[PDB]
């Protein structure tokens, strides 16, 4: 699916 | 325990800029993507965009790019949503919405703000 | 744009009826997509993501299928805080689309 990066 | 408030409701003229506001509470802001969606009075649901708040990183749906601008204050837990240039077919009620984000992708949207009225018009 | 068609659009049922309300995409969006529940004044509300996976505290009688263009929700027996309005949403690709909504109202 659409992802926006890592968030940790 | 999981909360977004949003900011009251707005009133702009044509040509306007309107900044709409949505601060989390009850769950780490930055841990999860963080989507705004309006709907128009009697009308189904528009995404309009999201926001990684760790990083500032967006990706601003097609028609709305170059007008519409995502950002956030992490030490206020607050995204923000600036949607420009107004017309009347921008009236409707803004969301702003966590997704579940498990992954690093999208899952689902499941806290949702209580929403922010936007009326434009001459 | 993925184009996300909902039916029925409108439906009447009576308490205790079972509901199912079908979801079809324009393409293939494996098993992204996700169920939600409206009220009006309301925010939706969600259901199922993953396709057919429930989410934590939603009534078990609420149940979803489908993988790839075909999906369904089905309500086994509707009660009354379920009549509202129902969308589906894929997260495939972007834009992020919904369902135009299926209304589900209470017949008397």
């Known amino acids: 699916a659409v992802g926006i990066g890592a968030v940790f | 325990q999981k909360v977004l408030v949003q900011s009251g409701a707005e009133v702009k003229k044509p040509g306007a800029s309107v900044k709409v506001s949505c601060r989390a509470f009850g769950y780490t802001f930055t841990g999860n993507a963080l989507h705004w969606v309006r709907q128009a009075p009697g009308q189904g649901l528009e995404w309009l965009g999201w926001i990684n708040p760790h990083s500032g990183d967006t990706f601003t749906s097609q028609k709305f790019q170059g007008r519409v601008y995502m950002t956030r204050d992490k030490s206020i837990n607050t995204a923000f949503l600036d949607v420009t240039r107004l017309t009347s077919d921008d009236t409707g009620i803004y969301y702003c919405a966590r997704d579940k984000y498990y992954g690093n992708e999208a899952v689902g949207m499941d806290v949702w703000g209580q929403g922010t009225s936007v009326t434009v018009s001459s | 744009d993925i184009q996300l068609t909902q039916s029925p659009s409108f439906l009447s049922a009576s308490v205790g009826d079972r509901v199912t309300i079908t979801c079809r995409a324009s393409?293939?969006?494996?098993?992204?997509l996700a169920w939600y529940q409206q009220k009006p004044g309301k925010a939706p509300n969600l259901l199922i993501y993953y396709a057919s996976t429930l989410q934590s505290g939603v009534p078990s009688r609420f149940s979803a299928s489908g993988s790839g263009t075909h999906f369904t929700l089905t309500v086994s027996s509707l009660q009354p805080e379920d009549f509202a309005t129902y969308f589906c949403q894929h997260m495939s690709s972007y834009p992020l689309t919904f369902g135009g909504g299926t209304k589900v109202e209470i017949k008397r």
């Open positions: 393409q293939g969006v494996r098993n992204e």
